[PDB]
Amino acid sequence: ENRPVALITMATGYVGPALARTMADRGFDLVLHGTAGDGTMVGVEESFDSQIADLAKRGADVLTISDVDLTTRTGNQSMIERVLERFGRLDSACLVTGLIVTGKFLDMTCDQWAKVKATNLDMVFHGLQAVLPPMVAAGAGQCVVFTSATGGRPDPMVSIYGGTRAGANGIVRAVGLEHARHGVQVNAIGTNYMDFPGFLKASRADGDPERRAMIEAQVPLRRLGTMDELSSVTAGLLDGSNRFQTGQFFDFSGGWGA
Amino acid sequence: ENRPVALITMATGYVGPALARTMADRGFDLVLHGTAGDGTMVGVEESFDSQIADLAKRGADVLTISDVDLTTRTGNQSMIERVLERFGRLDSACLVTGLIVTGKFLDMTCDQWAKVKATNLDMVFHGLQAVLPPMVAAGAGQCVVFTSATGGRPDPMVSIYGGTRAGANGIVRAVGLEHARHGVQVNAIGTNYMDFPGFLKASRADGDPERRAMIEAQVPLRRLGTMDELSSVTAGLLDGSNRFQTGQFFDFSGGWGA
Amino acid sequence: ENRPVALITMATGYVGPALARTMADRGFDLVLHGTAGDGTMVGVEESFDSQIADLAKRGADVLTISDVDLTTRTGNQSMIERVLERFGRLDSACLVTGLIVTGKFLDMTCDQWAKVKATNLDMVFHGLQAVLPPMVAAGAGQCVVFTSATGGRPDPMVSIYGGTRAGANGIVRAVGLEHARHGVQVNAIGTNYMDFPGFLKASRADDPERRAMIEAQVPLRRLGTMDELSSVTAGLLDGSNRFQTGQFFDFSGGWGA
Amino acid sequence: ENRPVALITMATGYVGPALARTMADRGFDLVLHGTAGDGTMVGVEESFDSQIADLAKRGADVLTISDVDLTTRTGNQSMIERVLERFGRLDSACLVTGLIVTGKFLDMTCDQWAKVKATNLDMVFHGLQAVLPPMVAAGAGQCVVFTSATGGRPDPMVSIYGGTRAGANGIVRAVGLEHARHGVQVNAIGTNYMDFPGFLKASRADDPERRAMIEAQVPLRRLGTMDELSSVTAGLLDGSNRFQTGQFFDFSGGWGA
Ligand SMILES: *C1=CC(=O)N(CCN2C(=O)C=CC2=O)C1=O
């Protein structure tokens, strides 16, 4: 048929898997970027193989990509070329970016500063510069850049991480408005306090019911957000249902960033 | 059998009709407040009688209410009283509020100041004071207060209207955070440049396609928003699929308020 | 000497007294609205009579106004009429507005709602509609409206107070932009954690242990002084800065950053 | 006597010259970083030499620095090393950062992206990492980082410039809150539509019709002067205001309101 194509990076963890499932139910074809290997590999919460079988049952064709560095121009340009080759179209793109670094500002090394710029900014710059040309040509496109809820409140101990996330949102706003007249939407979603293996291990909430209660007590809604909730909101900005929002940052942290 | 209940005010125009259809598709019973009469009556784009026919097809019981002053405590208290009588529960509420007024700040009469304070603030204060107790008791609830996109950018010629909309969003942020510990979400949507007869006639664009073209020229996405899109976004905050957002204001103006 | 004139409401308390002194030192004539009486009167931290003696020493004429209700159109229209009489000009206006109310949102009575709308909004609407025509005509004016730092972050327990302070800031933004082409600036300043009898008595700090707990909530770990707030406020009213209009400035030690 | 010390980078242009004068008048010793040479050298609107004469008249000792790369850790660490050598103390710092780049987002080369990351961010990260340790040990300090008014509204055609300026403000907010604890304040001032040879030449206004069209985009319908900017900047560095940290102040005549 004429199914549309969604691209989801880091799709072996975080929101990617759940987003891929519902995006398939919306009738999409999927190009998943992620980490190769099985569940025993680090950063692999749902293996590529495990998804392909389930997404096929939803009727989805899936192309997997795992040999690109998304902090560089080449890695992102090569990713989009391999999408347009397999499917000939790019309608939706969900670019998951960033890598967490915390600590005192005066304790930040030059390597931490170089890494946070590469993951929070270079990923967005080269990511958008690669997904926008195919959409501007087709006259229609939808893009969600996944930054961080700290972008709306860069706090102590999160200076260079929150600050660059604030810069990524600012870029998304400018880019979202610059290409609005071509009929493409670029929006940012910043989350925090999400219930997935990454956040659970980072906050030491894994296995400790008390520490998890303490982490939840920091959320106004007194809970951790679920991937199915995030995927639903994310898919709503990438499935063609909403076409009147661009250049905006949506906080998804249970009220923490209100 | 155990179908949640959604309250939608002003449901004879604006997002009400379209929201009622999709909310019924999410499996919700409805209580529609609005203006009684037929299509010829002022402020009735979709009459009551036409909707209960459609909403019953989708499987929704409907209660109609049209004899209340939503700018007063009594009107809103009576609305919720009659909701808890017919269905015995209030899971979601969509409180459309406000009435447009523009002009130079120094030209604003004391009547305009009194009316903008009643439609932009009194409706929100009394509306939220009414719908919140049933949800706090239930330990779960989703509320969307419709203010205006001008609340994010109170501009010249819209001083008192936009300013009080900024206050309504401010109330929504505080209320949304204050009751998040009870499982209740309260969020604000503020639109502009919508495709419905209310804005179409106010912008003098119901006919003149050149005036409509110069109107869409002010929207970054170069078009007017449809009610089917707004109902989709609004339903996402009222159907139980997203329970990790509260106290937040969402712009829906094609990037105008980004 | 054709000295510009500054109007300062609520001037018997809060920033009013300290702002008048510096404003005088910058060569201004003063119109002080405030509560009449002595120090034993409620709401009077620095009595009227005390300020005229000092304000005169700094070389300043002061007109005292105390018989207006600033929540009404007549109260503010009368105040400005009496300014344009004694001095015939209005260059700077500092409109202290608002009145605190806190508590659970669902506990808020209809009277608390009507009062916070009168003090946080009506004072701003009528206060601005009164001071602006005289400046728009002169082609130059500078106005600072005092809202609250809660306007920037309306939090639980301060729903209707902080929410209406947000609306006041919103009004101040549109008004400051709308009349910028006439060369008049309208900006808002919202403070919190100030060191003066008003805040000091409401937080039960007037108990060094409680006061230390108060300041622990401030990022700069201290309370702000009126001399500091007068300086920042006078900077937006002395003509030195004329490139800022329609903006809100948090002044809470970083609490509202 | 113990004259306090203020550091001002890029002091051969922008606010630097005018800020130097008023901060000298406020009883501050100075350390100016800038580009050495005469008025013929690019980027020198007020030559070094012409300044040292004036600040000396206002009673200020001034140490000059022109051999550091402020986008690197070494240049900043050396600049502050030489400040604590000549004067033994750092009380105030005005870190002017950034370099303008505009154009379509999809036309931006990897060199522009690299250059704007270095001028809008690396200058801030290394600037604050250098000036902050001396003030934390002193228990008091005042910093003002100069970003851009585009940080508050990163618009089309200013994608990666305004976006990185927004990240610079985000860092300033976190840093200003993280060290308020130690009695130091870090705040941001982002300007636009200023009357100095830099902006005048970029917008081709140095044509009265283009200048008038430029002032038409400003709500206050005028261009800001360095004497105005220095007043606001000095107020955040002279120890008068000590109740604001981690905040971003727009200074564009209301353009970023
Ligand atoms: C020092 C701080 C910094 O960010 N850089 C640039 C990146 N980098 C390293 O961290 C090591 C070598 C290098 O180029 C500095 O050099």
Ligand SMILES: *C1=CC(=O)N(CCN2C(=O)C=CC2=O)C1=O
């Ligand atoms: C109930 C809530 C409200 O605001 N009002 C109007 C104001 N009012 C009082 O609070 C008491 C008398 C009155 O008019 C309500 O009646």
